[PDB]
Coordinates of C-alpha atoms in Angstrom, one line a residue:
Chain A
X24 CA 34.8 -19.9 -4.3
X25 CA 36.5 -17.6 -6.4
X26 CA 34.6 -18.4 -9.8
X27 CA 32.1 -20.3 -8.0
X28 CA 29.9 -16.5 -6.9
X29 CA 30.8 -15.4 -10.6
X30 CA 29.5 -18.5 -12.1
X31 CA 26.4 -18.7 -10.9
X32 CA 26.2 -14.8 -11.2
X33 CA 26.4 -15.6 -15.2
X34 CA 24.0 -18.1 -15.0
X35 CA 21.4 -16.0 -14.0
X36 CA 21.8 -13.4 -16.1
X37 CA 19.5 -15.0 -18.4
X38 CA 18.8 -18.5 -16.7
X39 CA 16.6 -17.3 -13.5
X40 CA 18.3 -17.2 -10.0
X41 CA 16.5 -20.2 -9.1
X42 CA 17.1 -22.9 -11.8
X43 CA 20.9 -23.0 -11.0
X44 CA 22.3 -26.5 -10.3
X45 CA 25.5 -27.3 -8.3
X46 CA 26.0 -29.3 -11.3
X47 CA 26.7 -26.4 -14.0
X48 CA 27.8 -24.1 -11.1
X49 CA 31.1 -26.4 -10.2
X50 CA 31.6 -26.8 -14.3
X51 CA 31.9 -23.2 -14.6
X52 CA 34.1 -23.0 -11.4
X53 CA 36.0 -26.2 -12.9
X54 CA 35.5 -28.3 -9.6
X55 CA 34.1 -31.6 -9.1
X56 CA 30.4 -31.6 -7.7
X57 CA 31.3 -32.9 -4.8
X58 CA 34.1 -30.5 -4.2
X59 CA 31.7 -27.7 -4.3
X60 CA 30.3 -28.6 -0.8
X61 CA 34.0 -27.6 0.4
X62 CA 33.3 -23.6 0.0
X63 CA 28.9 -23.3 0.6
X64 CA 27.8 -25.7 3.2
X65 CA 24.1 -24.9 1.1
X66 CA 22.9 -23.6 -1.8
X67 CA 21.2 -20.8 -0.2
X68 CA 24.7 -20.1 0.7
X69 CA 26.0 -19.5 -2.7
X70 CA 23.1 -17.2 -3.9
X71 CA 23.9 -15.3 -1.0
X72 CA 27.4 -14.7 -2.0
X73 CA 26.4 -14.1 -5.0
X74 CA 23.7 -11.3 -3.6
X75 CA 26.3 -9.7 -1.2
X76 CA 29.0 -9.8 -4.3
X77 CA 25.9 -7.8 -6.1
X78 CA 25.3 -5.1 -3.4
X79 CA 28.8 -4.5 -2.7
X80 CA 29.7 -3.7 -6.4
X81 CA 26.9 -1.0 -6.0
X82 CA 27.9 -0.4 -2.9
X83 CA 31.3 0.4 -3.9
X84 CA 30.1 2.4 -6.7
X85 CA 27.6 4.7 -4.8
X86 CA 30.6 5.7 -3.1
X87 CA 32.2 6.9 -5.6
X88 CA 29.8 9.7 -6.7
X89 CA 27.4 10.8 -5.1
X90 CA 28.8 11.4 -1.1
X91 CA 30.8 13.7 -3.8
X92 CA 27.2 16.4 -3.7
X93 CA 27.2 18.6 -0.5
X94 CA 24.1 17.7 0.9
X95 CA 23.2 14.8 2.4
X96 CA 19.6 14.3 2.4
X97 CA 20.8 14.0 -1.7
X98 CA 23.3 11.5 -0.6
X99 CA 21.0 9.2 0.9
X100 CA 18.0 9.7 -1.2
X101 CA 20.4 9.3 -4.8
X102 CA 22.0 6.2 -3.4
X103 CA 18.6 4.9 -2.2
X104 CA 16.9 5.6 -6.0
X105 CA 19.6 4.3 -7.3
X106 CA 19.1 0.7 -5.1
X107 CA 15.4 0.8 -6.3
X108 CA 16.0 1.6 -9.7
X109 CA 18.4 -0.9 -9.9
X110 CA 16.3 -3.6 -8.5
X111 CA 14.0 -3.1 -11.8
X112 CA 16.3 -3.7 -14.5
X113 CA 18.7 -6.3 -13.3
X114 CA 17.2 -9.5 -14.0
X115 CA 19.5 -11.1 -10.9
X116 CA 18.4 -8.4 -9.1
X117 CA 15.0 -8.7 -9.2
X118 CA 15.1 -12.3 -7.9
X119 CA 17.2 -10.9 -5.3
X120 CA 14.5 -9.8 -3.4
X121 CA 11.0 -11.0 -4.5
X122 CA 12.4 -14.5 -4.2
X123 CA 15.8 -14.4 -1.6
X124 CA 14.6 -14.5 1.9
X125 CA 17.8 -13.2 3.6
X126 CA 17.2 -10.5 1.5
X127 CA 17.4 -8.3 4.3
X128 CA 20.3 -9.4 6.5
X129 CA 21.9 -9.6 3.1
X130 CA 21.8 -5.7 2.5
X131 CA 22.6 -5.2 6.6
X132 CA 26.3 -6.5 5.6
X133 CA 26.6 -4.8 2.9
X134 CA 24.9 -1.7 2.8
X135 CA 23.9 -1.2 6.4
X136 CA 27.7 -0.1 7.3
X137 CA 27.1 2.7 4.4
X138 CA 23.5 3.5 5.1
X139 CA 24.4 4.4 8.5
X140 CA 27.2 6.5 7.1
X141 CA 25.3 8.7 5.7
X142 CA 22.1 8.3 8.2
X143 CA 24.8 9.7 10.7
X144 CA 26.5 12.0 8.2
X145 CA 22.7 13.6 7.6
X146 CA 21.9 13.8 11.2
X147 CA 25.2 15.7 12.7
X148 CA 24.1 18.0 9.8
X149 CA 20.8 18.6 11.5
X150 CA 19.8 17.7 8.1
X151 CA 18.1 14.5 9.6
X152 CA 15.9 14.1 12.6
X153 CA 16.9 10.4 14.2
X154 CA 16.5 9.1 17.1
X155 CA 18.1 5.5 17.2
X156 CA 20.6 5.3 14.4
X157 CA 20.3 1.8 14.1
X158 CA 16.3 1.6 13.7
X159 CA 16.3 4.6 11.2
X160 CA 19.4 2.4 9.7
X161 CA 17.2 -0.9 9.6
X162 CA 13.9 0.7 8.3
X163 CA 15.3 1.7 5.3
X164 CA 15.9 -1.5 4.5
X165 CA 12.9 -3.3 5.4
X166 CA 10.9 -0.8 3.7
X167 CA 13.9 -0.2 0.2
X168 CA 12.2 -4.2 -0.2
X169 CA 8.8 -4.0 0.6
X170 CA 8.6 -0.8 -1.8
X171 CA 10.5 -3.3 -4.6
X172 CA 8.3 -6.4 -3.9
X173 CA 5.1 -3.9 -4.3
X174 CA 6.7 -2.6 -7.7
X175 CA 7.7 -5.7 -9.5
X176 CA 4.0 -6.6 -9.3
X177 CA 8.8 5.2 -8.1
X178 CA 12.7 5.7 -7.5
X179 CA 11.0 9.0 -6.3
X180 CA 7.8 8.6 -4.8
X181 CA 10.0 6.2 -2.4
X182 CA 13.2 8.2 -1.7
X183 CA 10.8 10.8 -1.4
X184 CA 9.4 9.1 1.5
X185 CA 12.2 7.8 3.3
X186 CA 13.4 11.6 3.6
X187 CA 10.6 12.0 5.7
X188 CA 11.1 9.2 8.2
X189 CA 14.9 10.5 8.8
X190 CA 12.8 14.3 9.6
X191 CA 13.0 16.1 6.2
X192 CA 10.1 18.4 5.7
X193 CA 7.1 16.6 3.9
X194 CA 7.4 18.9 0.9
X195 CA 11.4 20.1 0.9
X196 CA 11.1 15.9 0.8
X197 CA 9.4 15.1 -2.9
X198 CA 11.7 18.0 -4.6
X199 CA 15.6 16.0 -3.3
X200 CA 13.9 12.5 -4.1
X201 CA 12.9 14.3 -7.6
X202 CA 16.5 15.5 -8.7
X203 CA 18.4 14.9 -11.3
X204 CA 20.0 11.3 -10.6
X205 CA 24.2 11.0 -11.0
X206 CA 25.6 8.5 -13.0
X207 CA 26.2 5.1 -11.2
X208 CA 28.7 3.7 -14.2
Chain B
X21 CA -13.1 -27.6 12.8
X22 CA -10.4 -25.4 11.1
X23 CA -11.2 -23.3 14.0
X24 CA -9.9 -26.1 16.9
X25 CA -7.2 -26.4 14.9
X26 CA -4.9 -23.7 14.8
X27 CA -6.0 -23.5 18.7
X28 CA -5.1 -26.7 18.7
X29 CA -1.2 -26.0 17.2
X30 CA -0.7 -22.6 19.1
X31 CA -0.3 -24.1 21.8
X32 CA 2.2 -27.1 20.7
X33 CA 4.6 -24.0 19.0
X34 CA 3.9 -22.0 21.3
X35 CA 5.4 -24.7 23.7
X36 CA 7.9 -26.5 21.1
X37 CA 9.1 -24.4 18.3
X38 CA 7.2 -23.3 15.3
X39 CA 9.6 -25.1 13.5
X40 CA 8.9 -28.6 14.7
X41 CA 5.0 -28.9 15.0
X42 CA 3.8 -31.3 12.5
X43 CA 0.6 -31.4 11.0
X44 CA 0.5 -35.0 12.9
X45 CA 1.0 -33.9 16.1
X46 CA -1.2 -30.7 15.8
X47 CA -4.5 -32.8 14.4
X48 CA -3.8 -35.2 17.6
X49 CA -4.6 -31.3 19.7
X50 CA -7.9 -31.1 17.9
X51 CA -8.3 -35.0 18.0
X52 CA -7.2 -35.9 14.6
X53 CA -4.4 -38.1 12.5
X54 CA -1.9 -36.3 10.0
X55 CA -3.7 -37.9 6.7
X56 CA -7.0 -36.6 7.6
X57 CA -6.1 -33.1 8.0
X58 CA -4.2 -32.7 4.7
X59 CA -7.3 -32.8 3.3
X60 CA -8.8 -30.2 5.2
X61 CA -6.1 -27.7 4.9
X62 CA -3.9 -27.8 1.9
X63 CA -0.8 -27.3 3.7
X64 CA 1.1 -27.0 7.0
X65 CA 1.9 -23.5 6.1
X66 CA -1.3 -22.3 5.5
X67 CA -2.5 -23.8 8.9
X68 CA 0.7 -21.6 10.4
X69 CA -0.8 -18.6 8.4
X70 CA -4.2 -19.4 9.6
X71 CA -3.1 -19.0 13.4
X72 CA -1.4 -15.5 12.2
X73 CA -3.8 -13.3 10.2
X74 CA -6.1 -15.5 13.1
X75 CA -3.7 -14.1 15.8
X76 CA -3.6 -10.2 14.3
X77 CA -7.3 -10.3 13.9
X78 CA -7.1 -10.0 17.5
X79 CA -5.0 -7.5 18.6
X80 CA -6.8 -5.6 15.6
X81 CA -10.2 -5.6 16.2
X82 CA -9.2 -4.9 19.4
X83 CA -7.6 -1.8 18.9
X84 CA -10.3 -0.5 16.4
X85 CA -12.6 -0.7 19.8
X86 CA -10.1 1.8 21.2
X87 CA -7.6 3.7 19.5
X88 CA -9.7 5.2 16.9
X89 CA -11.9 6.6 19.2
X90 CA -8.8 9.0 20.2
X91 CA -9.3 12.7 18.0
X92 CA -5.5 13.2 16.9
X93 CA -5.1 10.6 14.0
X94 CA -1.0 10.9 14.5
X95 CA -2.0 9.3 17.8
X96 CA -4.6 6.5 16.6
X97 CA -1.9 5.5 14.0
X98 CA 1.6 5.7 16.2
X99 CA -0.5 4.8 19.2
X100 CA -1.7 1.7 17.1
X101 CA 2.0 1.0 16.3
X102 CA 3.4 0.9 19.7
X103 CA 0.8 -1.0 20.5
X104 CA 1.8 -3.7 17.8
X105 CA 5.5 -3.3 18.7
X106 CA 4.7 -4.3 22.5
X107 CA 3.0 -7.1 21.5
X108 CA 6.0 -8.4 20.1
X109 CA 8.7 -7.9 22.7
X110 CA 5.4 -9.3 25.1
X111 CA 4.4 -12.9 23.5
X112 CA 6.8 -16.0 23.0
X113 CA 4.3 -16.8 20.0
X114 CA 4.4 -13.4 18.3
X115 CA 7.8 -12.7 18.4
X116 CA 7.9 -16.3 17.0
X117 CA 5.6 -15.0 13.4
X118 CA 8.0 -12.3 12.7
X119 CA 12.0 -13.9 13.4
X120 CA 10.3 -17.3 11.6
X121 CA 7.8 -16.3 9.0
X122 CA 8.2 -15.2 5.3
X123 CA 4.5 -14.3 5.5
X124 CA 5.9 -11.9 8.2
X125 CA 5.2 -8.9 6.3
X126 CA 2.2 -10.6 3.4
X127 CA -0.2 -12.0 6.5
X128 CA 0.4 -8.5 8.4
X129 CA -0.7 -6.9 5.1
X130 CA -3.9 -8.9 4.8
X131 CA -4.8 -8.5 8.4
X132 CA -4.0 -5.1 10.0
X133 CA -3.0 -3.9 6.4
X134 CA -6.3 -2.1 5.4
X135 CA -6.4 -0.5 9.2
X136 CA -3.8 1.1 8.4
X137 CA -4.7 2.4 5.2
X138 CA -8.1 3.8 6.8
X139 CA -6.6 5.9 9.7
X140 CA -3.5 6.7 7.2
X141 CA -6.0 7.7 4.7
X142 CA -7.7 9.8 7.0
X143 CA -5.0 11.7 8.8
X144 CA -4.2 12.4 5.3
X145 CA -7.5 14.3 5.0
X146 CA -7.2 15.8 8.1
X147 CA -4.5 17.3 6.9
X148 CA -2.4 15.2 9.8
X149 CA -0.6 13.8 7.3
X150 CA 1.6 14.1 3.7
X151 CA 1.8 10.9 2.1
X152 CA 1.9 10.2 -1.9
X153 CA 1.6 6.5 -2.6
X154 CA -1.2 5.7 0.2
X155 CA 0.1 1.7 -0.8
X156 CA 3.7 2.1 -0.5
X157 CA 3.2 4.0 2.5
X158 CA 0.7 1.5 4.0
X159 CA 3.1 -1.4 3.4
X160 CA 6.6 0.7 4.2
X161 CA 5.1 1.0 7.4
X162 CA 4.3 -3.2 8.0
X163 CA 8.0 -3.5 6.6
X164 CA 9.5 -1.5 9.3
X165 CA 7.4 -3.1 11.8
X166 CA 8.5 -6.3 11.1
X167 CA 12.2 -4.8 10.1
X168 CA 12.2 -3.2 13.6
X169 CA 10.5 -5.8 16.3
X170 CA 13.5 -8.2 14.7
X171 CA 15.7 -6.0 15.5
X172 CA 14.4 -5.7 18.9
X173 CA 14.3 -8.7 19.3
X174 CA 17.9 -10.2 19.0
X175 CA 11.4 1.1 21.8
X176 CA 7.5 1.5 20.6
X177 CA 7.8 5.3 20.9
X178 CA 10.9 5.3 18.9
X179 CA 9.6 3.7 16.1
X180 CA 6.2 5.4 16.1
X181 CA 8.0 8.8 16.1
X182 CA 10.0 7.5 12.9
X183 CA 6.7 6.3 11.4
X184 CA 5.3 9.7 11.6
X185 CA 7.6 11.7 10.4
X186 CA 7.7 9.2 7.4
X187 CA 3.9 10.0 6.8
X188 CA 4.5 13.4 7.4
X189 CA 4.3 14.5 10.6
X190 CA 6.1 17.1 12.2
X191 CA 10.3 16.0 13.0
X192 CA 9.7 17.1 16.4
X193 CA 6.1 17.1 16.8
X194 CA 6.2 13.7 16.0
X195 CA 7.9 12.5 19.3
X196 CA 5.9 14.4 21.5
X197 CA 2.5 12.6 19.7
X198 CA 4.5 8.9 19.8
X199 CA 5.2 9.8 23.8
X200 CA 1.7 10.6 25.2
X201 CA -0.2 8.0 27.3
X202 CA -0.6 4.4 25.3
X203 CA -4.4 3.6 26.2
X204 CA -5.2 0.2 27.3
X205 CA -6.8 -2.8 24.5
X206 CA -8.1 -6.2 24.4

């Protein structure tokens, strides 16, 4: 399990995340085929791991730089544009949404502890108008994929308008979405 | 025919699970084998899709004979929200499209999608509203739906209020508009 996620992370990288076979998978781990079905009951299993794995590592690395600017509604928006904008260049990425279906439980265990962190953070600011925690939490999740789906076929124009559902004025909105981004890495 | 049909199978999921109505069993409904449909429809899953665009078509057209009559287009909008996220948490076979479909959110686009872009649209020329991507906001908003009845599902006003204030509306004006009296439909 331990090379198994990181095997199949590396062949996607340049392979597709959906023309991965156990059969290379459990070579790369260094497993037998049918030793594989010992750690992922499916294969929709694996890619998950291997998603979660993904989200984390950004997760992780959000973290560590931007909850590091005073204001919030930065906070959420920067780690936000930096999901979307990630979403476009990473190749394994991509997939991870216009083609992986638990696409959005996947980001509610490993995200949705964070984004409520700072959807809660924002709000005992006054910075952020919310009233359920947990549907503000899950909203901007459903919508960080159905803005991705619509754009792999705007880091801004969408943090921009997330803003706005947790209360930020309209306008005061588009300017935070629009500033200069941290580094991630 | 391929209207008897998907009458035909919304009653058999509706009354055995989505998940286990095959196209055999749902031709027998509208007195038919499982090889002689196949031909009709292409697939099983475009039948299922055909009995939910077919499904919101309802509830739509239905609330375009109301809820655009009201003046405030905050109100048409949330009001048609709420109205969607009651009929969720109200029907064994619509809170069986959302928590079971993929076409959850691309059938709901095709459907109510453009109703939503017309009174969006519109309170945006009001002035009622501040959006910048009239499509992201449009599909944002079908995302959440769906996002929110599952969470629901495993509150209307809530999520309207939120849906406002994404489009633009007021923080706290935006409650107020979500709370007022939810007319009656179809």
């Amino acid at each position: 399990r331990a090379r198994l996620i990181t095997s199949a992370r590396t062949l996607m990288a340049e392979r597709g995340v959906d023309n991965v076979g156990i059969a290379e998978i459990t070579e790369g781990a260094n497993i037998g085929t049918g030793t594989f079905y010992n750690y992922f009951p499916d294969r929709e299993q694996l890619l998950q791991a291997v998603a979660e794995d993904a989200f984390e590592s950004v997760g992780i690395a959000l973290d560590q730089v931007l909850t590091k600017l005073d204001d919030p509604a930065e906070v959420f928006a920067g780690s936000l544009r930096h999901l979307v904008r990630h979403s476009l260049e990473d190749r394994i990425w991509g997939g991870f949404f216009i083609q992986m279906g638990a696409a959005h439980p996947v980001l509610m265990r490993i995200l949705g502890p964070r984004a409520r962190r700072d959807l809660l953070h924002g709000l005992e600011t006054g910075r952020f108008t919310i009233e359920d925690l947990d549907l503000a939490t899950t909203c901007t999740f459903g919508s960080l994929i159905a803005a991705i789906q619509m754009a792999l076929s705007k880091d801004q124009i969408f943090a921009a308008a997330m803003l706005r559902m947790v209360g930020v004025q309209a306008a005061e909105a588009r300017e935070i979405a629009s500033r200069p981004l941290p580094e991630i890495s």
